[PDB]
């Protein structure tokens, strides 16, 4: 083999061509950002939420 897959059919494991060490492919941090606010009629402080 050279590369593996999963049920989702995505590249998650791969073998290096230069050497014989098996690696993994995992995406790094991602996702939508959320906000917390009490409205502009009371204050203006906001809290960012990841």
């Amino acid at each position: 083999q050279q590369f593996g897959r999963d049920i989702a059919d995505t590249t998650d494991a791969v073998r290096d061509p230069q050497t014989l060490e098996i690696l993994d492919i995992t995406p790094c941090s991602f996702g939508g950002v959320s906000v917390i606010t009490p409205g502009t009629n009371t204050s203006n402080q906001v809290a960012v939420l990841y």
Binding site: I7, A8, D9, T10
Partner: protein, 50 residues
């Protein structure tokens, strides 16, 4: 007026029914079909999405 003449009998019947449904909950895995149905439908929707 009929509760206090067979209180021990109805208590024993209640305990027996509780034990019976305790056995029947783990008797078969098909008694919860709605829950694994919606879980399987969500998992299959995600699987065909990817």
């Amino acid at each position: 007026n009929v509760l206090y003449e067979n209180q021990k009998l109805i208590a024993n019947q209640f305990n027996s029914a509780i034990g019976k449904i305790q056995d029947s909950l783990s008797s078969t895995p098909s008694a919860l079909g709605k829950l694994q149905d919606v879980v399987n439908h969500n998992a299959q929707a995600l699987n065909t999405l990817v």
